[model samples]
Target chain A: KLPPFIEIYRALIATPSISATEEALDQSNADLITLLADWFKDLGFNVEVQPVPGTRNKFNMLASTGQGAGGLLLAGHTDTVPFDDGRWTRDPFTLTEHDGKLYGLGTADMKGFFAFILDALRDVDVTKLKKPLYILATADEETSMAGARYFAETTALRPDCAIIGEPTSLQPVRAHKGHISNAIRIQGQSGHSSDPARGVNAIELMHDAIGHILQLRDNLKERYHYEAFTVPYPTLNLGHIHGGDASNRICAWCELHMDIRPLPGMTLNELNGLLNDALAPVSERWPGRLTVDELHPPIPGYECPPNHQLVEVVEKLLGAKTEVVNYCTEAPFIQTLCPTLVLGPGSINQAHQPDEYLETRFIKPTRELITQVIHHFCWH
Target chain B: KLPPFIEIYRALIATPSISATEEALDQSNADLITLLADWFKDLGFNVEVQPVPGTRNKFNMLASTGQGAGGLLLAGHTDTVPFDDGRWTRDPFTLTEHDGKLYGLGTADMKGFFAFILDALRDVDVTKLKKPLYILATADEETSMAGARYFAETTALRPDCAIIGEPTSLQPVRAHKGHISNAIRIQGQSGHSSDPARGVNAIELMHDAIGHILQLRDNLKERYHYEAFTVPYPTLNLGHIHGGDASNRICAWCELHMDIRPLPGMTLNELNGLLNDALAPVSERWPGRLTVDELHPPIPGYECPPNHQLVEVVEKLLGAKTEVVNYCTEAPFIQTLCPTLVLGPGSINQAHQPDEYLETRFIKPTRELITQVIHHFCW
Candidate 1:
C-alpha cells in the first residue's frame, strides 16, 4: 500500500493537521505522527512518539534506523498553515493533479519531501548502513514552529548533516530568514457610538498602532538589506487585521497579525524589543489598554557559509547555486543540533499559495537527490 | 374558528409579513393580505384587493359596506418591521401570552387592532349603516407607506373621520415624526494587506464620511426644535453601519443606515435635497467612487390642526390628552385624504421593542372604544 509514490504523497496531503493561534482552530498533530511512526516502524527504524509536554494530542516523531554520532537526517514539518477557504478553489486536503502538477496543501512546503524519502529508501537495505539515517517529522512549523522547537529543546536529536526539505526548488540553501508573528491588540472599551467619552475607540488606537508599524517598516527598509535575496531588504508584512463588530458600536478591541523576515545578522529578540519600544508611546496616549503578545517565538535567522561541506555536497549534487530566501522554515529550529542545509524538490513560491503544486518533472530528480544524500551521509 | 377576538389576534400574530429595504428580507405582504380579504369577505363587506402598481405581491385591501361620499375608515398596516431573532425571548411570529401581555412582533404596533375591530363588529349589522364603513389594510407601512399613499392617490373614499390604529396607548395623536434613511456605499479596491498603495480603502473614506455626518447632525440639532414633542428637535439616529470583511484586505465597500426624525414643519423633499448637497463635498473627494443613495423614501411630515374635530372626538371619548410622539405611523399618508386621527390600544414605547406586547387590560377598553366609534360614525 505504501509502495506507490504519488499515493503516499496523496495520503499525507489528506490528513488535516493545522496549527493556529486561535485555540478553537488549533488541532492536534497526532494523526500525522501516527502515520509517520507506522511507516518508519515498518522499515526497521527505531520510532519514538515523542510526547510534547502538557498536551494530550500534539507529538514530535523521531525515526532512526542505523545510528552513529554524525548521521544523515531528513526532516520536515507535519502541520500546515491555516488554509483560507475563500482563496482555495478545491479542498486543500484532497490531492488534485492538473497541468502536470500535483496540487494540495503541504505539497511544496515538503510533505511531498517525506513521500520522496520513502521512495528513495524503498529498494535499499537499512541494515547495510555505515551510519544512522533518520526521518524527522515535527509539528506546527507553519505557525509557531513549536514542534521543531520542542524537539530541539527536549530530545537529543543531533545529526552530522541535516537536510530540511523546505521547497527550495531542488537547490541548496545556505541562508534565509527566521520568522516570528504576534497578535498586537489595542483593547479599549466599547460603548454607544454617539458618545466619544463613553469609551476609547480601539479601532482608532489600532490606526495609531498601524502608523507605528508603518514607521517600523520604513525603518527596517533603510536599516537592513542583503543583495543575495529576491527581496534584498528585510520585509515586514501586515498579514491580517480584524477589529470592531459594527460601525455604530464603539470599537472595543482590534488586532493585527504581522510577520518580519529579518536579515541573517539581526536577532528576533532585538526586533521584538524595538516593536515594544514603538508601541510604548501609543499606550501612554491611553494607559493600560495596549498589548503585544507573541504569536510565534522569534525565529533566529540561519546563515551557513558557502564553504561548508553540506552546502558544497548538495550544490555539487544538484548543480545549482545555494540560495537565500525570505520565507520562514523549520530549519531555524532543526539546525540547533547540527549543520543543516535547506534543499527541496518544489518551488517555495507555491508553498502557502492556493492550488499549491510540485512540478511532475521535478519528482524524479528530488528522489535521486535524497537518495544520494542518504548514501553520502549514511551508507558511505 | 373564524374570528374569536383573541383567536383572530393569535392568527394575525402567527403570520409574518416583514418588509425590509433589503430585498432578501423584503418578503411578500400577500399572506396577511389574503387572510384579511378572506375574513372581511366572510363578514359580507364587498372586499376589493387593490394591487399597488409595479409590485408583484404587495397590495392594498379595501373592504366597504353601504354607500356614501363621507364615511368612517378604520386602517392599519399589513406589514411590520423585520424582526431580530436573537433579540426576542420567544418566537416573534408566535403569540406568547405571559404576565398579562400578549407578546408578538406586530402585537403592539398594529395587527392587534384588527382583532379589536372584529371583536367590536361581532354583534353589529353593517346593513343598518347610514354612511359607508370601510376597513383599509395597506402594504409596507413600516418601511414605506406606499399602500396608504396608493389608496389616497387612486380612490375618492374621502372619509369624514379616519382613524389609523397605530400604537398611541389609546390617546389620539395629531403629530409625530417623518422618517427617511439612506444607504451610503464607498467602493474602493481589495488587495493583499502587505501593500496599501495597490488599493483604495473604503473604511478610511467612510471615516471621513462619518465625520461629515456628525457635522450635519450638529447643524440639524442647532437649527431645529419644537415645544410640542419630547425630543422636540430634528433627530438623527445612526441605526446601523457595516463594512469590510477583514482588516488585512482593503475594504471594498461600506454602508450606513440612518433615520431622521424631523419636527412637524420640515419637508422630506427639502431635507433630502440638503442631504444630497451635504454629501456633495464627500462625492467631490472620491469623484466616481462614492454613492449616496436612498434606502427608504422621505416620509413627509404630517401635522393635522392640534384642535381638529376628529382629534377632539377621540381625546374626549378616550379621556386622554392628545399626544405627540417620535414613532412613525401610516397617518402621515392617510391624513392627506381627510382629517385622520392616530389612536390605538398599546403604548408607542412598546412598539418595535423586544418582547413587544399589548397589555391584557388594554383589550376590553380598546374593543369598547372601536365599537363606540363605529356606532357614532357609521350606524
Candidate 2:
C-alpha cells in the first residue's frame, strides 16, 4: 500500500533538497525527483526524469496519466530554499502538526503540495480520462529557475492550461512585475590626487553616469505606467557602490550595483535598450572605460490576460477575484507552453519565513480543487 | 685649559643632542649646554644657563665678555637633527676628516659653529674690548625652535647686532622664504549610498573646497611678487589628502594637507587671513563641518634690509653679493633682538646629506671674517 498523506509529507520533509546560489548551501534535488517519480510510476503513471542542462546533480521529472490531446499540467519545484537554522523553533526537516497547522521548512512553500496532489490523484481513475495530466517537478527554482527554463524551452508536453503551485494563499495571481539587476563598472587612470589633471578619476565619471541613470529613472516613470500595482511605475533602486582605495589617490575603478523592477509587458530587450541609452553618453564621453554586466539572467515580466478561461475557472472555484502579486514566479516560463496562473494552498507570507507552516483548513479545499480540475479537464 | 679647535669640535660632535618631533628620537641638550657654560666660566666670562620652558632637559647658554651697551651676539643652536643610521658612510658622532672636509652630522649645520666661536674668542682679550661680546647657544632649533623662541621672547642681553651661524658658505644671506603648513578637514554625516539626499557628503564639500583653494592659489600668484628669489612668489603645494572609507556609503569625513612658502615681507597673519578667506564660504555653507589646523608653528619670513650696515659690511668683507635662500633658519626669531645676518662656514647643500661635511678651505676666511665683525661691532 502507498503511504498515507501524512507519511508522504513526513518523508518529503525529512529529505533535504535545498537550492542556493552558494554551492556550499546548495544540494542535489535528484533524490526528491526520483522519489516522486517512483510513487507516480507505481500508480501506473508514465514518468520521465531529466538532467537540467548546465547543472550538477540536479534533475526534473514529468509524470503523466491517460491519453494526451489538451490537458492540465500541475507544476511545483522540488528544491526548497536554504532555511534559517537557529532561528526556527522546531526542526525544519520534521513535519510537525500543532494548532491545526503543519510546520516544516517546505511545508507551506511547497514540498507539501506534492502530497496533496498525490492524495487527490489517489481518488481518481485514469482509465476514464479523455486528455493527459502532467505533474511537473523541477529543480533549483528558488535559486536560478534552471529546471523550469529548460522544460519551457525543450519539453514536448503541450497542455491546454498549467498551474504553478507557488505559495499564493489559495488565490489566483494573474500577473507579476519582473526583476533585472546589473553592475556597472568604470575604469580610469590613477595617480596622485595632488594634481587632478595627472590621472582620470573614475569616481567623477561614476558621478556623471549616476546623473544619466537618474535621468533615465525619471524618463521611465514618465513613460511607463501600470495601475494594477501600488507603485504603478517601474522602480529602480541603487543598491551598492564601491570606488577607489584612498582619497589622496585618483580613483582608478568604480562599480555600482542596481536593480530595476519593470512593469508587466516590458520585455528584457526593451529594458536593456533603455539601460544602454542611459549609459551611452557616459561611455562616449569616457571611451573604453565603461561596461555593464548582468548580475543574473533577466526574469522577464509575466502576465495572463484578465479574461482567460482558466482564470475565470480558478477564480470561480476559489470564490475570489484574480489578482496581481509583487513577487516573481516560474509561470512566465511555463506560460510559453500554455496559459498559466499561480494558485496554491499556503500564504505567500510564510514562504521564506522561519518556522514555516500551512493551515490545516486549506488542505481539504486544495485537494478538492485539484481533483475537480483534473476531472473537468482530463475526464471530459 | 680651554680645548683646541679640533678638541672642541670633536667633543661637540661626539655628544648626542638630537632634536626631533618624535619623542623617541628627541634627546636632551643639557650636557652640551653645561660643557659650554663651564668652559666660558673658566675663561673668566659671565655665563648663564636657562631651561627652555615646555621642554624636557633642554637648556640655552649665554656667555658674555666685557660689559657695555653695544656688542655683537654670536648665536648658534646646540641641537642637531637626527641622523640617518644606515645611510651615513661615517659615524655621525665621530667627527671624521676626509678629502679635506670635516664629516659629522652637524659639521655643516652647525654644532661646528660653536667650536669656531670659541676659537675666535680665544684670540680676543676681554680687558681690551670696548663693548660686550655674547655667545648664545640655544636648544631644539632643529625641531620647534623652542629655545630660540624663548630667547627671543625674554632676553635682557641686547647686542648691538646679532649673527645666526646657519650654513651660508661664508656668503651672507639677507632674506629667505617662510614656511607654513596646515591640514584642512571636513566632517559630514554617513549613511548607505542608496540615496544621495539622506546624508551629507564630505567629498563633495571637499571638491568645492579645492575649487576655492585653486582660486586662492591663482589670486595669490596675481597679488604677490618678489623678483629676487627664483620662483619669486608665494607657492602652495597640495601634499596629501584622504576621505571616507567606502564609495557605497556617503563620505563622512575628508582631510587635505598642504604647505605654503611665502616671500619675504609677508607675515604669517596675512597668510592665515588669506586661508580663512578662501575657506569662509565653505564654512558658511556647511557650518561646523570645516576646520583648518596648523601642522606646526608658523615660521615667519626673515629679511635684513639690502643696505643695512651688517649686510653691507658682510658683503664687503666676503667680496660676495648677499642673496636669499629657500631654506628657513632661526634668524627670524633672533631678528627681534637687533639687526641680524646669516653667514657661516659650510654650504646649505651639505646640511642634511648622507656624508655631511664642511670644507677646510672656508675655515680661515670664516674665522677672519668673524674676527673682523667682532672688531667692527664690539671693539
Candidate 3:
C-alpha cells in the first residue's frame, strides 16, 4: 500500500535541511519549501515563507486554508543535526520503509507528523472551512531554537488552539519542563610556581563554587519534586570546565558550563533567583574574582489547565488522558500565542537516537485521530 | 690581554654541550681532555672513559695520577643548559672581557674553575704526590644528576674525599637542600548534567586534598622553622592542576604536579608520609581512585660536620668559613661515594641567568688557591 504520509516524509528527509548548517539552511531547503508551498497552494491555501533574521539562511513557512479571525495551528521544525553517513546502516537522507516501519534521520522526529498533517488535509474542502487552519514549518530547531523564537515574537498568526507535531506516539502532552542554561567564569591572579602565596588558584576556587552548586541542587530537589517526570526532581549538572595550562604556574581563569531543567509551572526568575542566592556567598568571598552569566534566556516551564480548549479537545479526540513530559519543546512557545497541546505519532523513546523508526501500525490511527479532531472542531 | 682561564672558558662555552642534548659534548674540552690524558699517561696515570648506561650518549672521563689504595676525587660535569643566542648581548660561546669581567655562558659556572684546575696543574709534580688524585669530567649535570649518580652507585672509582666544583664564588659549601617531585592523579565517575549524584567529580576531590596540603604547610612552617635559610620554613606549593571537560558533565579525573624542597634533616619518605596522612581520608573515600606517584627519586641533602677534614682543608685554602646553600647539587651524590665539599669561583645567582659572567680578577686567585690546596695537602 502506498501511504501518502510516507511519500511526503521521504521527500522532506531527502531535502536534508539540517539546522544551522549551510547544507540545509542556505542551499538545500529552497526546493523543499517550494514543493511544500506549491502543494498547499494547490489545495487552495495561502502560503508565506517568512525569513527569520540573524539565522543562517533559515526561514519559517506558514500555509493557511481559511480566512478567519482565530483557528488551529500545526507547527513543526524543518531542520536536523548534521549526520555522519558512516554511522547509519542505510542512507540517512533516503527514507526506507522496511518491516512495517519507516527509517530515516527525521522520519520519526518528526517529518512524519508533518507529512501526516498534509496527507490528512489533502482531500479536505478548503472553501467550506469557516476558520483558519495554519501549518507553520520552522528552522534551526535542533540547535538554538532561533526560528521558533523569532516566529513567536514576530508573527501575528495567533491561533485559538495549537498542536505541535512532536513525536509522542499519538498521545496528548499537556505540559513539559523548560531549559535554563548558565555559564560561570572564575578569574584569579596567576603567579610563579615557587611563590603560591602571591596568587589565587582559579581551579580551586571553581571547585569550591561547584560544591555550593551541588548544595543548591539538593535544595532544588527538595523544593520542586514532580512525580509526573521520570527523575521526579529538578536537576543540575556541571557540563564542562576549562582552565590553566602548565603545572608550574597558578591558574588565572576557569569557566564552567551548567544545565538546569525546571519542572512544570516553575518561573524562569525562580531558578535564576535560587542560583544567585546559592552563588552569592562564594562570589562575595572572592569579591571580583567570580562571575556568573546566562547562556540562554530562561524559558518558563509550560502547563495547560485541564479545562483548556485544546487540552479538552485533544482528550476527546484521542480518548485518553494527557500527561506532562520532562523534555523541553516548542509547545511552550506556541502556548504563548495560542492554547497548545503536544500531539503526534511515534514514540519519544526513539527520539534523537540512531535507528529511529515509527511503527507503521500507529500511522492509520494517528491520521484518523488528527482528521477527526479537525473535522469535529471545524464543523461543530 | 686574554687571561688563560678566560681563554679556556670561552673555548668550552663555544662548544654548546647542553645537558641531555649533548649538542657539543664531544667537541666540548675534546682537545683539552686529549692533551690532559696524554700528560697524565706520561706521568703513569691510568685514564679511561667510563660509560654510564640509561643516558643519552654520556660518558665520564676518569684520570688518576697514580695507582693506590685510596685517593681524592675532583669531579665536575661538562654539560650546560641550552641558551638562546638572542638573549646574550655578546656571543655566549665566545669569551668576552670587559671591565675586568669574563662574560660567557659557562664562564663562572665551573667552566672557569675547570680551566683553573688545568692551568694550576701545570706546575704540580705528579710523581711527588703520595696519594693519587682522580679527575673525573662527567656529563648530564644540568638535567637529572644521571652521570654523577651513575658514578656514585655503579662504578668502582670510590675515593676518601670528593670535591664537586660547582660555583660557590670561592666559598666552601658544606650543605644544601634536597628535592622530590611528584604527580598526583585522582579518578572520579562521570554522570549526566541533570543528576550529579550519579558521578564523582575528581577536581572537587583534588581541591579538598589541596586544602589539606595547605594545612600541612602551615603546620610544618611552625614546627620545622630553619632560621638559617632565607625562607625560615619548609615551603609547599601546588604547581599545576588539570581536570574535567565542562560544567555539565562529572569530571572523570584530575592531575596535580608538585615539587618539594626539604632541608638537610628531612627525608623524602617523611614528606611522602605526611602527604599520605593528609590525603588518607579522601583516598579512603575514593578507594583505588586516587594515586600519588613520585616523579623523581629522593636526593638526600648533604651536611658535613663543622670539623670534617675536607671542609677544614678547603676553608684554610680559601681563607673563609664554610656555609650552606639552598640549591641542590651533585654534592649529595658525591657524598654517597665519599665526604664531599662544594667549592668553586663564582656566584650561584649567576648560574642560570642570561649573560652570565665571572669576575676576571677571581681567575688568578682561584688558580692559586687550587694549587696551594693541592701542594699543602696532596704533595
Candidate 4:
C-alpha cells in the first residue's frame, strides 16, 4: 500500500502525537489512528476505532483479520513527548538516515516499531490464517497511560498474548518497578522580624517535616528489598524543594516534591498511607500546616512467571534470557486483559533523549524476529 | 530665637528626614542640621557643622554657649524612619492634635525634644553661664546611625554628662540592648529533579546552618543572665527565610535574614565570631556553601552605672529609679565622650506605630526638668 518502508517510517514520524498533563500541551492522536487504520484496511483487516469517552482528540485502533478466542496483539503507543528543540542536532520530525542509524523523535520510541510491524505482515494472506493477528495502537503512553487503560476496560475482542513494542532493543523484559510522585505544602503566618511570637515561620516548619521525611526514607530502606532490581532496595528521592519570598519577613508558605520507586510487594496506596501516618506528629504540633497532592496516578509494577510460554518463546527467538528494567511501560495496564511482555526494536537510553535514533543494522534481524513471532502465535 | 513651642515643634515635624539602608530611600539630614544651627546662632551660641566622610547630606551639629572643662550636652537624632503610609490614619508630615495628644511621624521619636530644649533655655542670660550648654544633633539614627558614629570618632569635646532625649516618658534609662542584623546566603548548582546526584541543594545546606544557629541560641541563653529585662537573656529571632524557585528543580541559591538583640555585656564582633566558629563543621562538610553579610553596622549597647550623677539626679527629680529598656538608642555612641542617660517626654509605645503621638500634657513638666538640669550643670 505504501511506496517504500522509508516513506511509511517518514509518514509516522512527521505527524505529531503529543500528550501531556497540562491541557494546553496535549495534542490529538486522531491523525495517527487514521493513518494506521487506512494501512491495515488496505491489507484486508476489519478496522474498529474505539474513541475514548469525554475526549475529542484521543482514540484507540484495533485492526484485526481472522477470528478465534486465543490470538496475538502487537501494540504500541501513538504519542511522542514534546520535543526539546534546542538539544536536537536535526529536525525531530524528519526521518534522517546516516552512518547506519535512523534519527527522529519517535524513531527509537516507537513509531519505528509500528513501521517494522507493517513490513513483517507485508506478504501475509489474512483469509488463509488459522488465528487472528491484531495491529493495536493507543494514545498517551508517555504521560497518563489513559489509552491503554481504556482499551483494557472497553475492548470486546480479547487476545491470549500481547507484546508492548516499547523499545527493548531486541530483548524482552517481563518485570519492572512502580512509580509514584507527590508534592507536600506547608503554610504558616508572615510578619515583621522583630519578634518571633508575632508570626509563624513556614520554612522552619517545613524543615521539621523534611527531617521527619528523611527518617521515613531511612526506615523504608531498612524495611523493603527485592533482589531483581540493580539496587534491590526501594528508592525515595527528595527531588526538589522551594518556599518563601524574602529574607526580612517570616516565611508564609513552602513546598517539596519527591518520588518513591516501589518494589513488587509494595502497593502505592499502602505507601501513601504510611506517609500520612508518619506526618501525624507534625499535624498534632501544627494543625492545618501540612497538605499533599499526587502528581500522577501510580504506575503499577509488572511481573510474569519465568516459566510462561511467552517468556520461553521470546527467550528462544532472541537467544538471551528474559530480564527486568528500571523504566516503566504499558505492559502492566495491558496485563489485565492478557499475559503481556515488552519486546521492541530500540534502546531505552535513547527513547526520551535528544537526537533519538535507532541502529539501521537491527532492521533485518528485527524483521525476521517479528515474522517468527507472527508465524508462531498468529498461524497454526 | 525660634517660635512659640507649638510652632517650633510643627516646623521640625514637617521637615522630611528619612534614612534607610536602601540608597533610593535614604535622604539628607542637612536641612535639619542647618535649621538647628541657625536657631542656635540667633540665641548667640556658636554652631559647628561636622559632615560625615564620603557623604554630602549627612552631618552632625554641635552648638555651644560658654567655654568650660565640664558641660552638659542635650542630645538627639535628626532623622525619622520611613513612614508606613498605608497604616497611617493622617498625613505623616502634619502634626495632628486630638484629645491632648499631638501625632506625627517624628513627634515621639523625636523632634519634639528640640522644642522643649529651646523652651527650657528661653530666658537664660548667655553672660551668666558658669559651664557650657551644648546642643548636639546627629543624623541617620533610624537606620545606619552614621552621623552619631562620625561625631563620636571625630570630636574632642568631651562633655562631663549628656542626655539622649528619645521616647522614654520622663523616666531615665541607664542601660539597654544592642542591635545586629545579617543575611546568610548559600550557592549551589541546580539541575533536574529526577536525579539527586546532578546538582547540589542549597536549601538543604541552609537547613544545616539554621540548625547550627538555633544551637548557638540555646548555648547563649545558658551563659548570659540579666534580671533587669523581661526576657533576661539575648534573643535571636529567625525572622525570615527563603530559597529556590520551583519545587521540581534542585535549588541553586538560597538566603536567610535574621536579627539578634544582644544584652549589655556582649559585643557584636564577639557575637559574630561565635557565629563563625559555630559554622565550622558545616564549612568543613561543604567548603563553599555558606557566606554572611552584615545588613548594617551593629548598634552597641549603653550601660551607665545606676549611681552615676546624671542617673541619680534625674531619678531623684522624677521620683523614679533608672531601668533598662529593650531598644537601641544614640546614647551608646555619645557615651564614648560623656556619661549618657536616656530621658525624654514621649512614650515608646507609640514611637514606631501607626499615628505616632506624644501626650501634650507632658510638655510643661519636661521643659521644667530641662531648666533644672541646665541650672544645676551650666548656671
Candidate 5:
C-alpha cells in the first residue's frame, strides 16, 4: 500500500537533500518535494507544493484529505543537515541497517519520520475521514526555518493540533527558550593617538557599554526565573567584539555582537527595552555615535502550556511526561497557526551527527502510535 | 687655491646623498665622503674615513691637522633628509641661487655648512697650527644619528670644544629636551567571549594601564618643570594602542607605544623607574604579563652649561644669546666627546622642507665668524 516502509526509507535516503547555512552545501529540496508529492498523491491525498519566497528551487509540500475544522497536522522537514563526510563509518546517503538500527544521515532526524508517516497512513481510509490529516514536508528547516515561517505566516490550513516531527525520541517538547542576537556599534572619530582630545574613541565608549551590558546580564538573572529550564534563568553571551585597525590610531568605530536566551514569558519588546535602558547613559553622553540593532529576526520563546490538550494527549500516548528543551526549532513558528508540540520517533542527539541512525525497535511502535493518533483525531 | 664658494657649494649639492628611515629613499654617503676626503687631503689635513658599523655604503669622515688638545672641531652632517620632489621649483640636487639665497636640498641643513668650513679654512694655515683642528663630516644624521653615535662611542680624538652645525642660524643652542619612546605590552590568554572566566583580556588590562599612565603624566607635570623649553614640563604622549582581534574572542595581547620628553637632569634609569612605579599595581596583579621596552635607543637631554667656553665664545661672536631648543640634534652624542654647542647658519624652519635655501648674506659672515672662532682656539 504506498510501497513498503523499507522501500520508502531507501528512496528517501537515496534522494539526498542536504541543507546548510553555507550556500555551497545547501541543495534544492525540489526533488525530495517531488518524491513526497508523488507518495501522498498515490495515497489519494490532495498534494500542493508551494515555492518558499526568498529562496531558489526550495519548496513546501502540504498534502491533506477530507474537509476539516479540527484535525491533526503531521509536519516534518524535507531537508537534512549537511553531514560530516570523513567521520561517517557508512555512506551517509545510503540507508544501511545493522544491529537493530537503520543507519543514514537523516534516518533519525527526520526524513525517516516521513517514511513512517507514509506507512502509518496505509491503514487510514481517506474516504471515511470526517476531519483532515495534513502531511507537511518543509524546506530549509535546519538553516533559517524559511519554509515553516513562510507557511505559518500565510497558510490558510488551521488544524486543532499540530506535531512537528523533530526526532524527539517519541516524547513531547512543550516549551523552549527564545533566542535574539544584536550588534551594538559605536561610531567615533579617528585621529592621531598622540592627542586624545582630537578624536572620539569607539572602544572607550564600548568599554562603557560593556560595563552596562554586564550589569544588565546581572539584572536579568536577578529579575527573571523559570525553574523548568536547567539553567533556570536567561543567559547572555558576549560572542564577538571588533574595533579599530591599528594600535597607533584612535579607534573610530567598534561593534560588539552578543546573544541572549530568554525564558518563555519574556517578549522581544521587553528585552529591547531593557537593552535601551542599560545604554541610556552612553547614548546621552554621545548622542549620535551609538546604535543597537538586531543581528537577525528574533525567535521568541515557545510554550504550549503544561495543561494543553495536545500536550496532555501526546504525553499519555507516549507514556512519558512532556519536557522542555534548550535548543530552538520551527515549533514556535508553526504554533502561530495552531497548538503545536514537537513529537516524533528517534533521538535528536543522533539527528545532526555523522553516522546518524534510528533504532529499528522505534519503527513498529512509532508507526502503530501515529496510526492510533490519526484515528483518535480524524476518525473520532 | 680653492674652488669658488659657489663651485664647492654646487659640487656638494650636486652629489645625491640622502639618509632616511625608509630604505628605498636612503642612498650611500660614500661619494660625498670621498669628495670631503680629497678636499681635506689637498688642505694638508690628516683625513681618515671610518665605516659606520651595522651599515653598508655608509661612512664618517674625520679630518684633522696639528697636535695637542683644546682645539676647535667643526662638525656637520654629510647627508641631507629625503626631499619632497614635486614641491621643489628648483632641482633638489642642483644648487640654484635665487632671491639672494642658495637653494638646494641640503643647503641649510646642512651640507652647506661643510662648504662654509672649507671656504673658511682657506684663510687659516694648517701647517702652523698650535692646537688640533678637526673638520668632522658625519653620516646618517637625518635618519638614526648612527654616524655620530658610532664615532662618539669609539673615537680616540678629543677636542676641547665642538660645534655641531645644525642650522641654528649661527646663534648657539646650549641645551635641548631629550626624547625616549617605549612600547608597553600586555600578554593575556584568549578564550571564548561567552565566558569571561575562560581567558584573560589584554584590553581590560590596557585600560587599567592607561589609567595609571595618565596619572603618571600628571605626576610628571607636578614634580618636574624647566622653563627653558616651550612646553616647559616633560611631556608624555600616548602615541599608539592596540589589542585583541574580534569582539567575540577574549583579547590575548595588547601593546601601547608612548613617547616622553624629559629635561636634562632626568636620566634613562630615572624615567624607567618612574614607569615601573606607575605600572606597579598592574604588574603585581598580572605578574609576568606586562613588559615596558624601548622602541629605539633613547636620546638623552643635551646641555652645554650656560657658562661653558663654547657657549661663551659663540654667543659673544654671533652677538646673540645662547638658547635652548625644543628639537633634538646630534649635539647630545657629540657633547660626550667635548663641550659642544649647536651653532650654524640658516633657519631650522627651512631645513626639512621643499626648496630649502640659505641666504648668501649669512655665508661670508658665517665663514669669517667660524674662521675667527678657529683662530681663537687653534691659532
Candidate 6:
C-alpha cells in the first residue's frame, strides 16, 4: 500500500498556497495540519503550530516524535509556484492518477515528498526511539525564502541533521550554488530638442554603464569555475531594464535589475565589489550622478564535505554516490543550525512545470528508505 | 470741447481687455471700434476696421484724414495689463477725478493718448490735406508684442514717420534697448535612489549651465557698455527654473526660461554663440546630453540719429529735451519702415500700475504736437 500519498498531495495542492498571495495558504492546509497534528498526538509525538509573522495566513507545523538530542529534521515548504488553471488539462487542484503517476501542482515538486515522510512515520514506535524526529512544514519557498529563513534564524528547535525534502528523484544531493539580486539607477538633465547644447542626456551614460556590467559578467564567468555543477561557472543575467518617457526626448534616466549566481566558495560581498569595480569608471565620469544598490544579499552557498556524518549516513542509506546541483534551495538557509542534505522523492525537472506529476512507483521505495534511515539512526 | 477724451478713455478702460484674453476684446473693444469707425467717417476721413487673425473680435481701426504719401503714423496698443480689482481703491473702469488727476486702469498708459489723438484729429481737414494721416490701434502688447510685431513685419503701409504713443511723459524719446526670450530643457535618465551609479542626474548639469549663463551675463556687462541707457550693460535674468519630482530621486531633467535684454548693436545670434561656447566643455563631457533653443530672435534696438528728420520734427514740435529710455517698445517696428520717435502723452511709471492716471494738462500739448507734425509732414 502507498499509504494515501495521492490523497494528502491532492489536499495540499487544492489549498492553493502560492507564496506571498493570501489564498496561497488557506483553511484547507490548516485542516490538514490539524488532522496530522491529531494523528501525531495519538502516535505519542509532541506537536505545535509555530506562528511565523509577516506571512499570509499560514503557520509552521512542527512535530517531534521523541525527546531531544541528536535529532533529524524532515523539512519542506508548503507553498508552490502560481499556476493558471487555463494551462491545465485536468483541474490542477485535483489529484489525477494515471499509469502509476499522480498529477498536481505540488505533487512532484515537494508535497508528495512530505506525504511520504509523514506516512513512513505512521507506524514508528515513538517512545522506544532514543532521538527525536522533527517534521517542519514552512511557507514562501517559491518566492523569497522568508518563511524558511525566519524559522532558521529565530526558531529554538535545532536538529543534528536536516533533510530539506525538495524534489530530487530520491537522490542524495549535497551542494548547490546561491543567488544574489541587485539594481542600478542613473539620472540626467533635460533640455529643449532644438538646443541640444544645454540639456544633459543621462541615457547615453547608462549605455556605458550597462556595457561595463556585461563586461563584469564575462569576468565573473572566467574568474569562477566549479566542476561539480553542470554550468561550471558563476553567472550574471540582466533580468530587466526600463527608463525614459518618449522616443523624441532624451532619456534622462534608466534602471537595470540583475541576478548573479555565485559558486560555493564565493561570497555575495565579493560579487558586489566586482560589480562596483566594473562601474567605477562610469561613476567617476558623473560623480554623485550614478548609483547602484544591492537588492538582496546572496544566500551563502553550501558544499558539504564528503566525510561528514550526514553524508556518510545518506550514502549508506541510498547505496548511491552523492552529487551537487547548480540551483539554489532552502538547505543553505537551514544549514546554519544543522548539517543538511537534500534527499527527496521526485525530479526537479517536473517541479515547476504545468501538468507536473510524480510516479506512484517511487512512493513506496522512498518511504521505505526514510523508514530505514529513521530506524538505523535512532536504534544506533 | 475735446470730444470727451475722458469719457472715451473711461469706456476703453471699462472694456477690461487683459492681454491674451479675448472675451473683453470681443464684448467691449468691438463696439469701441465700430463707434470709432463711424465717428472717423463722420469727420470725413477714410476709415477701415482691419481684423487681425487669431484675435477674438478685435480689429485695428485705420483712419486717414487725407490720402497720398508722407503721412504721420499714430500707433497705440489696445490691450491692457492684467489687474485685480481688489488691488484698486475704486473700480478700474470708472473714471474718477481725484486730486487733479483721472484715476482708472490704463488711463495714463497711452489709452489716454489714443483718445487724445482721436480728439486732436476730429476737426482736421481731410479732403484738402496734402498727405495722409494713419492711426493704427493694435493688440496684445502686455503679454506679447504679437500684434505690433506682426503688423510691422507684414503691413504694406510705410509712413514718413511713426509716433509709438507709449506713456513717455511728452518727451521726444529716440532710443530704447530690445528684448529676446528663450527656454532651455535638459534630459537625464531616472533610476532607483540606492543604485545611483547607473543613472545620470540632469539637474546638476543644468546648475552648471546656469552658472555659465551668469558668467556670460557678467562678460556682456564688461564687454558692452552703453552710457545712454540707465543700466549701461546688457542684462540677463533667469526668470524661472523648474525640474525634477522629488529630493530622494536624482533629478532626471530641468527647464530654464530666461529673458535677455541687449543694448543697441548686440544681436541674439551673438548671445547664442556666446552661450554655446560657454557650454561646449560640459556638452563634450556628456556628449549628446545637452541642448538649447531660442524662443524668438532679438527685436533690434531702436536708435534714430539725433539729427534725423522725424527726430528734429518731434523735438521742434514739442520744444522738449530728446531722451533715451531703458524699456523696449514698438518703435523698433516703426523704425523698420521709417524713422520712429517715442513721443507720447503720459509717464511709464503710471502705465502698468493700479489707479494709473495721465496728466490732463499734457493732453492738449501732445495733441497740438501731433497736429503740428502731421501738418508739417503732410504739407
Can you give the TM-score per candidate against the true fold? 0.61, 0.65, 0.89, 0.88, 0.81, 0.56
Best by DockQ: 3
Residue-wise lDDT of candidate 6 within A1-380, one digit each (tens)? 23465565666667666664445343324554565566567666788886667655566778787776778888888777766657777777788888788888888778887778768877777778787888887767776666688888887877778888898888898888777776678887765322223555555566577668768868876878878777677766554445555333445666666667778878767877888899999999888878887676457677766677888978887788889986778888788778888888878988888888888878778988889878766765
Q: Write the per-residue lDDT of candidate 1 for residues A229-320, one digit (tens) a residue.
A: 76666666554555665544566777766667677778877888878877777977888888878765678888776687888888888888
Best of the two (4, 6) by DockQ: 4
Best-to-worst ranking by lDDT: 5, 2, 4, 1, 3, 6
What DockQ would candidate 3 receive versus the native complex? 0.43
Model 6: residue B171 alpha-carbon error in angstroms: 5.8
Top candidate on lDDT is 5
Better of 3 and 6 by DockQ: 3
Candidate 4: which pairs clash?
Answer: none
Candidate 5 DockQ category? incorrect
The backbone clash count of each candidate, in order, is: 1, 0, 15, 0, 8, 51
Residue A84, candidate 6: how far off, in angstroms? Answer: 13
Q: Which pairs of residues have clashing backbones in candidate 1?
A: A66-A132
| Clashing residue pairs found in predicted model 2 | none
Give the TM-score comparing model 2 with the true structure, all chains together: 0.65
